[PDB]
Amino acid sequence: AALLQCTADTLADAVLITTAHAWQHQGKTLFISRKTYRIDGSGQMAITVDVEVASDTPHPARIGLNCQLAQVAERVNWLGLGPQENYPDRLTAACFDRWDLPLSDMYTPYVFPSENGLRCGTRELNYGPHQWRGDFQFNISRYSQQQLMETSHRHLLHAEEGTWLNIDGFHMGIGGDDSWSPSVSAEFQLSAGRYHYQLVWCQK
Amino acid sequence: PALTEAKHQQQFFQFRLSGQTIEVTSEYLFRHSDNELLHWMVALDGKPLASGEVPLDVAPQGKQLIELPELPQPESAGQLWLTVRVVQPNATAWSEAGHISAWQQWRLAENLSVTLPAASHAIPHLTTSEMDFCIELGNKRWQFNRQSGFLSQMWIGDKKQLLTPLRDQFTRAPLDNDIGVSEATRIDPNAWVERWKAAGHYQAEAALLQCTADTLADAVLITTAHAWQHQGKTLFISRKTYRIDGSGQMAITVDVEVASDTPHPARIGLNCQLAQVAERVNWLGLGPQENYPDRLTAACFDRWDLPLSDMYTPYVFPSENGLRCGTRELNYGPHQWRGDFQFNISRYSQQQLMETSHRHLLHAEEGTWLNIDGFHMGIGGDDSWSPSVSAEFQLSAGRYHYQLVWCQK
Fold first, then answer.
1. Which of A37, A46, B208, B212 could cross-link B149 (Cys pair, CB 3.0–4.6 Å)?
2. Which residues of chain B are within 8 Å of residue A56 when distances are taken between CB atoms?
3. CB–CB contact B116 A4 (8 Å)
4. What domain count does chain A have?
């Protein structure tokens, strides 16, 4: 990521920050992301993200923003499809209700570790002090995405301090009919080339 | 307008493209392509860097592989477009020479531009009244009405740009398919028009949920929230923010929330009436035939120029018509529109179109009605009698976002 542009401005009731980032590989830009942060008098924070994906580039597996949080919580409470991990390609099993689970549960053990435990169509996500409001797909786990890709086996992974949190406006479909060849459906892939999602960061 | 769509789908030749290489498959059972000419033009942003023409020699059921000279690469931001069409060098008894049997369009690898608009020395100055919100930059003046919650007037000179305040429109004149067999004497529950009419979708009246005025150092930003309520039930909530550049180019971002219960809005768009009248409409998008999301296959993406009369499509029975889709930029007269949207520009108001029994009856309203839609519902339909619209085409998302830029000149 590089900063294409950045700015700071003050609303009478709130402060608004706008950041533009371009992701470039080999002189070619895979994605352009524009984010504006607006701060309420209440102090609740609203994030609006606009993502542009080049038509040429293979479609991004997911579009989301990921942060690492020092705080660790016993239980994760969210309102959305639950309680089993669900994906857009296979979200049929899940149903929408308030959900409470042990934090360990969110992670799904696999012999081979790949991104897992994703939850979809969640209006609000609650972990510890933080409250998240909006429509998004969130996976919350100790292990970093980079860590998950690296490890040969599930047993090997050691949880990083704090909890990694991922929030995705859109997630690519898991698939697949066939392991050998891509089994993902055409509709599921995020080929739109234009993407918009917004969420709110709220204390308590 | 539909007939062109039939021609494109019907055409015997099938084109599959991998990388530089283009492969053509012949529909024909019995005939070799004795006199077929294949022409390919590559253009960027409505401009073609190169044109390639190859003679075609495919036996019936035959597959012919054609490889382009390596395409020019443009540093400039934009999307490369490759268009291949087949024309007959010698006219058949039915067709004059230079007639085109088939065409195909493929996007080239996309280009994303990280170049930045900023910065412009001029800064917008806004003057506030209880009655109205006024923004002035240079000669141009922008007026927003607090009571209304929409900006009534756009100012040039020494001139007034628009007769009618810009507003969100969730309805389009009913298509033949939507109306179906439904009649005032014998209304049918199933028909799309009936669902909308029962909904109060047409009669819903906007209210200002909230409004505000703020000044950026380089720009002035206005935020309006509107709730459309019928019978104590809110069909849609729309939030719009207008940001004014130092350049004075204006950017609109619209967020629309639709209740899950309500029948899906036929279109989500904002429609305004403009006093100015222009001889020709120039836009970059699918062209030149009117196209809809359900049937946008016929249309191809290139810079398009047409007489203003052309945009309207004559119908014995008048329903919303002449819509254009996937248009990056729309140009009418002084105004420039930048973004991705579906636009129909016509003299007749949508309200007028729905009202009239016959096409002949309509009389053009002064100025030109302009409609811009972030998303448009699919026309359909397999059957007139029952809704033929596909499930995917309908805008059931319940969340919608689109943004466009209003630019002078």
1. B208
2. 108-111
3. yes
4. 1
